[PDB]
């Protein structure tokens, strides 16, 4: 199942990214808090999940630790508008399949998901 | 033996980075061509090597493929002044332990090596 969970305190963004995700047949999700995404993350099977860095509860880079703990085969994408090569690297070796800034187009956004699964396989 | 090979068509840079590397007891090296770094690479044991992207023969990101072929346990660092998050990621999953732009300070430069080994272990 092309299930995907988009975690972002910005309903404005998730709303858009959710339109393109649901269009490809995928199941886009929204989460304003990580803790909430963790409860369901362990209560259901999620192939690929998207979690930005700019989080209210806590950064996303560190959030991976939990995922890689209760979902090693799982793949999560880290995105942030602040931009940073340093944080990007450490965010790639943690549990981020790809690092994309805040602004993104369906072209690069869709390519991320499609590859997110194929890779996980 | 704290051996390190810095590949950069810029003798001006390698000259500096080589001063700090040799200071820590490491053995800094310079290479204006990849092909040359490949011959010696398979002619000796190299724990950590640094290869920038801006190369005359060919990009460094793709160069990793060769290393990961005749040196999987080996760790190489990819650096480029052009800067790019996209290329950075793909350069991290290839064989780059860390991604640092052109300009760098001994503080971040030394930290890369020190961790380069410890990590490889």
């Amino acid at each position: 199942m092309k299930r995907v969970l988009v975690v972002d305190d910005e309903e404005s963004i998730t709303s858009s990214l959710s339109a393109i995700l649901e269009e490809e047949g995928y199941h886009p999700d929204t989460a304003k808090t990580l803790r909430e995404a963790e409860k369901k993350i362990k209560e259901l099977f999620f192939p690929v999940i998207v979690l930005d860095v700019w989080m209210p509860d806590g950064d996303g880079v560190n959030f991976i630790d939990f995922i890689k703990e209760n979902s090693p085969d799982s793949v999560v994408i880290v995105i942030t508008g602040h931009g940073s090569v340093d944080t990007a690297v450490k965010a790639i070796k943690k549990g981020a399949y790809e690092f994309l800034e805040k602004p993104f187009s369906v072209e690069r956004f869709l390519l991320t998901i499609k590859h997110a699964f194929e890779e996980y396989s």
Side-chain angles (χ1 to χ4, degrees), chain A:
Chain A
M1 210 159 267
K2 315 255 49 155
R3 266 167 297 201
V4 192
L5 156 55
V6 201
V7 191
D8 258 274
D9 77 302
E10 201 56 82
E11 316 201 54
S12 290
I13 284 296
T14 52
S15 177
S16 183
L17 274 30
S18 281
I20 324 306
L21 216 65
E22 219 268 300
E23 143 159 295
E24 294 308 307
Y26 319 154
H27 306 79
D29 245 283
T30 74
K32 101 252 72 146
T33 49
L34 300 321
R35 53 104 145 175
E36 167 75 278
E38 296 176 330
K39 198 90 273 203
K40 66 180 87 275
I41 265 168
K42 309 219 269 82
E43 101 188 9
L44 87 123
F45 210 126
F46 262 130
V48 294
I49 298 191
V50 188
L51 152 60
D52 69 320
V53 171
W54 189 234
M55 278 283 92
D57 146 276
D59 298 301
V61 188
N62 176 256
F63 182 87
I64 278 149
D65 205 60
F66 144 79
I67 298 145
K68 287 289 151 180
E69 186 145 84
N70 86 112
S71 220
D73 66 279
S74 253
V75 234
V76 193
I77 289 106
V78 177
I79 54 183
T80 194
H82 317 298
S84 32
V85 69
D86 317 326
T87 298
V89 154
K90 44 130 62 141
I92 288 307
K93 299 138 103 199
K94 201 93 75 188
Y97 173 54
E98 207 80 351
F99 200 93
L100 285 154
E101 273 212 88
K102 248 277 94 60
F104 27 45
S105 262
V106 44
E107 186 192 65
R108 179 49 174 278
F109 138 95
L110 77 85
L111 184 95
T112 314
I113 298 294
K114 191 257 282 261
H115 291 224
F117 278 83
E118 294 180 335
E119 160 47 55
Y120 130 92
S121 197

